[PDB]
Design a binder for this molecule. Structure first.
Ligand SMILES: [Mg+2]
Ligand SMILES: [Zn+2]
Ligand SMILES: [Zn+2]
Ligand SMILES: [Zn+2]
Ligand SMILES: [Zn+2]
Length: 70
């Protein structure tokens, strides 16, 4: 559809497939989008429970940098 961006280059939006590019950058899982924190710098997303130490909730502040970018 010319009204939508093209599929993920890496997984082609196959929901049965892990993808560390468009879903959690550590586990590649798509579940819990509500719980996926996006890096202000590289735009990769991370489940709060995949981080070390894991977070039990997302921060209230908008500015967050991932393990790779810190
Ligand atoms: Mg942010
Ligand atoms: Zn993908
Ligand atoms: Zn990485
Ligand atoms: Zn994850
Ligand atoms: Zn980052």
């Amino acid at each position: 559809a010319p009204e939508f961006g093209p599929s993920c280059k890496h997984c082609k939006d196959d929901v049965n497939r892990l993808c560390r590019v468009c879903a959690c950058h550590l586990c590649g899982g798509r579940q819990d989008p509500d719980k996926q924190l996006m890096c202000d710098e590289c735009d990769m997303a991370f489940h709060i429970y995949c981080l070390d130490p894991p977070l039990s909730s997302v921060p209230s502040e908008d500015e967050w940098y991932c393990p790779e970018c810190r």
